[PDB]
Design a binder for these strands. Sequence first.
RNA 1: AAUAUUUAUGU
RNA 2: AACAAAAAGGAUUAGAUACCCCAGUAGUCUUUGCAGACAAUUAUGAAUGCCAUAGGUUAGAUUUUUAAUUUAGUCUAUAAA
Lengths: 254, 260, 224, 372, 88, 253
Amino acid sequence: RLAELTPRDYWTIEQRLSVINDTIEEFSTGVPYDENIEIGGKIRLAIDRCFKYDKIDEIIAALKEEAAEGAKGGVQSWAKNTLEELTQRSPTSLHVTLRQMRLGKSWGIAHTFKREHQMAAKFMKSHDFNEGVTALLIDKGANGPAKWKPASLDEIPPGANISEDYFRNDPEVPVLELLNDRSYMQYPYNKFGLPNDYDVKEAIEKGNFTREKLIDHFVETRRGKQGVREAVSDVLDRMAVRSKGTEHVQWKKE
Amino acid sequence: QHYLMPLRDNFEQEGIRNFLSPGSVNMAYTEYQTFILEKLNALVVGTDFEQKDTKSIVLATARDPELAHVFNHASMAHNNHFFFDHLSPVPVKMGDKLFYHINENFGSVDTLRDEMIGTAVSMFGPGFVWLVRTQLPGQPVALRVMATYLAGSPYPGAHWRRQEMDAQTSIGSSPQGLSNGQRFFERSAAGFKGNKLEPTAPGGTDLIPILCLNTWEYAWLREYGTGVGGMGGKLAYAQSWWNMIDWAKVEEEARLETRI
Amino acid sequence: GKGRIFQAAKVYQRASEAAATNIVSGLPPRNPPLWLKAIESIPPAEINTRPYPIQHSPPNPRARKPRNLFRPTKIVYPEDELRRDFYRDHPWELARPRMIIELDGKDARFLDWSKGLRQRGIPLSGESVVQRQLWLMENQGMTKQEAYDKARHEFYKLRQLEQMERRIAVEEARMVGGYFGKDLLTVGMELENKTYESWKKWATTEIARQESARASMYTNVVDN
Amino acid sequence: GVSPGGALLRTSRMFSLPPVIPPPPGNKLQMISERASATEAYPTHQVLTTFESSRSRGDWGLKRPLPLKSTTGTTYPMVKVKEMDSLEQITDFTSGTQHGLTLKKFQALNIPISTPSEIRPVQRSVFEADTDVTAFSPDEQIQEAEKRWKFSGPWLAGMTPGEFKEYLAKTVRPKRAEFRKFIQKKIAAQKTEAANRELQEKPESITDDEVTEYLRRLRNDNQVLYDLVGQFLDLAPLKPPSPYGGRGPPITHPSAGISYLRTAAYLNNHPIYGPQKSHPPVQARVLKPRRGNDAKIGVAGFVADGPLGSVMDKFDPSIEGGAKLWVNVDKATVDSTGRVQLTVSDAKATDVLIAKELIGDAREPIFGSAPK
Amino acid sequence: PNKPIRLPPLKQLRVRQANKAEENPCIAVMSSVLACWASAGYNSAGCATVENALRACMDAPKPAPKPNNTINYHLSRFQERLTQGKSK
Amino acid sequence: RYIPEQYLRNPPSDASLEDLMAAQAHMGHNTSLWNPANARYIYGVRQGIHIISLETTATHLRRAARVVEEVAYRGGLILFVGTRPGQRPIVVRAAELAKACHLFTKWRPGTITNREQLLGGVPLTVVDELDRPLSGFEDHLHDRRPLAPDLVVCLNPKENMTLLYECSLAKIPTIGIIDTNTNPSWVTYQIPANDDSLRATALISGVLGRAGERGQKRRLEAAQRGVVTWKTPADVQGYFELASARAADARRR
RNA sequence: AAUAUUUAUGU
RNA sequence: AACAAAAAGGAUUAGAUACCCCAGUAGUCUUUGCAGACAAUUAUGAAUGCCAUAGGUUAGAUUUUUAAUUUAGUCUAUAAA
Ligand SMILES: [Mg+2]
Ligand SMILES: [Mg+2]
Ligand SMILES: [Mg+2]
Ligand SMILES: [Mg+2]
Ligand SMILES: [Mg+2]
Ligand SMILES: [Mg+2]
Ligand SMILES: [Mg+2]
Ligand SMILES: [Mg+2]
Ligand SMILES: [Mg+2]
Ligand SMILES: [Mg+2]
């Protein structure tokens, strides 16, 4: 079907994407009936309460509270499993990874690749990469688990900053020369997926939709996209309250 | 499929204060009604009754002898819920209009009480005691008491399964025995041939069950025990039941003609 | 070549060209039909193109020049073999009226054949025995005969209880003053009477005709 | 790997329709009528139903809605679909009450099905693990083979001469090599039963020097060999040296699905009179009187020979609606041809009046009025 | 024995005479009268009973025509569905 | 979970694979009575009939629902055509939702190519953005020639081929339910499904009815904001410049 | 149901 | 033996060689040669590759041989053409 679509030479890039979006939705046979949103409700909220800091020490500290029985979150199972997965990875990558998540929100797509080039160039010289790859891929589980140079995160003292070296471009590595000169701070067309918290928020500020009347607004606006009713409902259950009874619906963070 | 619906005023969670324990109502309605409905579903899982309500099944499968087992579960579910939909957490004050109608048909409010309770114990068997509202074409609205056996139905459309009195202890050679026996054969003969003994108004508007009393043993033999020595048992169950009758609702569904 | 030429798949192309220029040269074209911009980005789909249809069974690997390559194939499942085997051992199982009309099509969402024959939504039929048989024959690694016996025996014990309820229910009802209508046995005989009588009339009428014919056939032209 | 649309069709209700089973096998060497055909012994198609809400619209879950003239008005909605879409662009269907209601009639008699036994009327039900079994294993002996009812081999006496030749040239001949192995496995035990006691005081089953040593010893005793040949070809026992092998094995399960009751050893408790001696009588028709020998009677749609005993003797056009007599069904069983043969025996007199009492047709009531 | 063929495309599927023609019943009674005369005599006594039957005929009124048969209408409906189709 | 008259009281916005299968939309004609050209939609063979792929019907149905919405959103005249014994309530219901015209009887040959004679005396009216009458076009409603549908939605293309051919001749888009024996080259947008089932026709037409309703809403919602989603038709547009031409004489004289 | 006479011409 | 050009006779007819009739020779048949012309036709040379379906039918094969697949012929009705 995609081969049949013949756009006019004077159509904007937006129209071309709209034509394809509507075509991809004609072949949707419906999402499963029993499969529920994995990262939603409690787990989704826990992620926003344990992955909002800029230090791995604080993140693990928050998870321990959730893991400890009696917490009001109710995700003791997920929290305990997450800690086991975080304590089995290179502590250097954790500090370095989390560092670019906070700075990555301030870079452009073009500047991102250039920095990642210098960033990934220093990993080839490090010891963790050469150890992890050789231990878990080449040896595929033989000789035991990978031995990271810092055995654990606690070893790294609080004041130490091992994430600084991996963000300093060196002269011996030339800056990446991209094939073109285009760039953008935000994605130009990333609104064809299910409506996320960003779309539900603005929709509530421009209007005065109700609990159920707001869900239908996205359904008809999305032309019946599969999963809009469940996705939008989930967002309201987490980041919305019953402000003026049934009629108004506002966010939680005041 | 038929699914269990919640009760009136949160009884499944707390149960009536001075009538039934929260665990008794749990075994009386939640665990039993679900059992009946489970059996009922399997019987109408692939029939026309798959999407019909209980009452529709009670009237449709009344005369057919091959669907008698289906009528039991249907009428039992209806009669059971009908009994719980008339109670209340706290006793309600009988209405003036209803209070005056009862005296005109039974002499006094308590005279009817001892009649229903007396009929429950005298019956000595699982059944339901109904307070029906009978109105003939030209007769005024008059009330009366009717007793139904294991899964009897008070509605006229199901007269084929009214099950008002037993045959083992009411059909003999005595003067009353012969009379009762004749009526038994007259009904079966008329019902089979299709002839109707008592004309009925269109729409089954003759009898309108207002109140009910589930005398089945599974509802009281746990809360009130057997009743050795007269303490508790079936007798006390019927007495305590009289205190929780939602007389306000009993008056609304009665729909007594304005006469005062 | 008798049939007419349908150019319905080119209405947009034809209609758009007719609106590009005006008949009266030198003037701007008039507004096009209101539907020209509605289906602008919804072209028709390719039709009249025979593809290789889905093969529901392995094609003959021995054919050196096979035919019917563009012919849809028959849908065959493993249950088809079992259905035929069951309903032949129980022919009167087909007299049990079964509904094939679907309510919402979601009856398959609640069928867990690991529990037993009794499921939600579907009645106890010969199909429940086949699916239960197929499940055991696959998960529990049972043979066609072994799994058949197991699922088949569970079917009997359930059918027995249903036939016992009818008898006990009617008898129980009459002990407390319960009367029923005409049973199917009596109703069936009354219908046979009405039909038999009609045959008696026809036979009586035909019998008269045959005997009368004999009188006319014999020559009684002269009476002496 | 199956597509989502194909996964729903597999579980569809229409796809569950079983294939049309072959009709009840009749005598091949006999004449038959060409155009007119009556009701068959047992049903070959599936009977369909709908909701009374949809029947008013002719919707039966088929290709197209059926006509309302020929499918509405009756009490029990039943339809048989020969073809969902014929060459005339129509659903070739027909009413299903002929067989649908005959099942309800029979099941209203409350009589189980028994195993035929040549003529102490000991009745044994069909649904018994002792006999109702189809799976087996090589350790099965000929004694246990008499209990089964589903053999994979044919019945020799029943097969026509031509059919017997095809069986020999298509199933028995190419099984020569495999049969020799069957004996090798048996002879592996012939050697080891010499060690029956060697330990208290099997070989690899390949010896061409042995399989020939055995069969040559069985030419003097042909009986022991036939029993050995039947095990390999799954042939129902024929000679007595038991499970009613005279007429052949049943082409269907003995019950045939008509009724799954196991015993009639119950006493229907009458409301007034109490537990009765016999079962309630049933009025039967009279077809083909004695005076084309023998008498027939229509008992609940089925045709069975009259009781051992009048209306039956001669045809009387005077009786209204035909000659109808009350009778009790004693024993019912399924024939090797698939038919339902009822051993019907005349009923008593008082029971007929006891039945008419409830129905109301009893002219003289037995209760109260009866002085003696 | 082969089965009936599928009719080729015809201009119209119909029966030439839908309604059965009922032979005048009294041409048969006349044939009998003509038989008595030949065997016996023109002016005899054995012919009285048969001649009266012939006189009873022509005195009786003609029966009413039977209702028209609608076979040709139903054949025109199922023509294309039963045969190969229609021609012309 | 099912009522016979549910596709009319509240038809569904979209059709799922279960709704299509429950409505017998996959039952094709006998294997012999098939158009080999339309074999691209057949899934297989069973019960002696051709099974139309449920996924092919849902895809072709949603695509058609998009055409009905856009045509109704641009002020187009739709015509729902179902000509069968029991297809009258279905077509009339779908026309009400989409504010379109219905046809539940035999199509008179020549109502499009010879509209001048057939639809000569039938009255018309001139409306505006918000679909309300405009006084001043009385003289235009006597010389104007009759209308023609901008989109014909046939529910039985096999029966009435005279209507579809006129649409092809008249350059009108068409939507039809193509059965296993129907020629797919007769309509512009095919909907492979069972057309003999009165339950499948109600679902298909119901979905298309909701589409028009959803399209008419957007058009009216966009008109209240002063945003017309369509320009004046060519015939009416011509009567404008001539109107001022007559008024030009008033200014002159 | 297997009937059977004869009928040329026309700027 | 029978049939039957020719020859001959009897009728029909305005006339009748003729069509019809009573009869009847070559010839049809056997054997051995000559002769080579036919609406000797499918008004269509033989052969090879290739193109979508349907309903019959002929001789086989396979199969859960009931009924469906399949090879080589033949005949109706159609699609693209
Ligand atoms: Mg069709
Ligand atoms: Mg001339
Ligand atoms: Mg001559
Ligand atoms: Mg001559
Ligand atoms: Mg001669
Ligand atoms: Mg030569
Ligand atoms: Mg040549
Ligand atoms: Mg052929
Ligand atoms: Mg030939
Ligand atoms: Mg041809």
